[PDB]
Structure 1
Amino acid sequence: GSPNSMATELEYESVLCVKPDVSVYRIPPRASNRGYRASDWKLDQPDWTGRLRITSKGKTAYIKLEDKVSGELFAQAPVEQYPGIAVETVTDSSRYFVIRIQDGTGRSAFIGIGFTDRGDAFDFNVSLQDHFKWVKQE
């Protein structure tokens, strides 16, 4: 038998949260003597803006970011458990996160994202933990 009829087969995702408005900021590096505090980021001048698409399959969640005009992928961050290495919070305001976006080949970057309100950023952190609760043995 020969499996060589397939090679790119990532035609799967269970959607968890979608929002039309999210803004990216390239952040300074973490240290507990400063923290990520949202106000240190480029809140007046995003590096990119577009749409949120939190997705998952099995034990791996995917924070995908997508364009608001082209529908194309900007970036994606894969996550094995929440909280974990690929998702972080700020100190000052509950509407801002950081994620470890990856190219699927050992390339990575930490990018900051901001929401319109805390009551919508709560949906980012609830939709992640309400996927992982069984992996978290709750």
Structure 2
Amino acid sequence: GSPNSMATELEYESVLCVKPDVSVYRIPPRASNRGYRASDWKLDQPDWTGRLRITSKGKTAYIKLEDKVSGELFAQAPVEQYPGIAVETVTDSSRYFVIRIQDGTGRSAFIGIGFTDRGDAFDFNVSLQDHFKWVKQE
């Protein structure tokens, strides 16, 4: 389907990754001395689960979260730099992340993420490492 606003611009996004099972944390904090630390909030207590998509329109990737049954959009997070505010590693274990999503009303929210596998989360990282390796004046 077409986007809610269109003026014949380059409103595309090219698929980079899919993962079969993913869980989220609507976390309380923003900025602790070490980052976010999953150990501080909800690392065993998700609020939603579904399916992962990652897409990219040029230098910008979009983490898009999908329903496990029908593929319907839960949330989306635009990123133009990695590491950044739009995808961060908690403190260090890349079993988890934190991303900045849109709420779809002209506003944003931060959610933590936890995966079904430690390697599926490390591949969520690598899907963005190999997206930012050829930009960022490298």
- Superposition TM-score tier, normalisation by shorter sequence: 0.7 to 0.9
Shift of 1:75: 0.2
Counting aligned pairs with the same residue, the percent is 100
TM-score, reference length from structure 1: 0.83
Shift of 1:32: 3.4
Shift of 1:110: 0.4
SS in 2 for 1:89: coil
Residues 78 and 2 of structure 1: CA distance in aligned 2, closer, same or farther (over 3 Å): closer
Instruction: Report which stretch shifted further, 100-109 or 7-16.
Output: 7-16
Shift of 1:31: 3.4
Match of 1:17 in 2: 17
Shift of 1:116: 2.4
4+ aligned runs moved over 4 Å, structure 1: 1-11
Distance 1:117 1:2 in 2: 34
Contact conserved, 2:13 with 2:56, CA < 8 A, in 1? yes
Residues 7 and 25 of structure 1: CA distance in aligned 2, closer, same or farther (over 3 Å): same
Distance 1:32 1:50 in 2: 28
Gaps of 5+ in 2: none
Cα RMSD between the aligned structures? Answer: 3.9
Residues 50 and 10 of structure 1: CA distance in aligned 2, closer, same or farther (over 3 Å): farther
Residues 39 and 58 of structure 1: CA distance in aligned 2, closer, same or farther (over 3 Å): same
Shift of 1:36: 2.0
Distance 2:17 2:41 in 1: 24
Aligned length: 138
Contact conserved, 2:22 with 2:50, CA < 8 A, in 1? yes
Residues 9 and 117 of structure 1: CA distance in aligned 2, closer, same or farther (over 3 Å): same
Contact conserved, 2:103 with 2:109, CA < 8 A, in 1? no
SS in 2 for 1:123: helix
Distance 1:80 1:68 in 2: 27
Contact conserved, 1:95 with 1:116, CA < 8 A, in 2? no
Larger Rg: 1
Residues 117 and 11 of structure 1: CA distance in aligned 2, closer, same or farther (over 3 Å): same
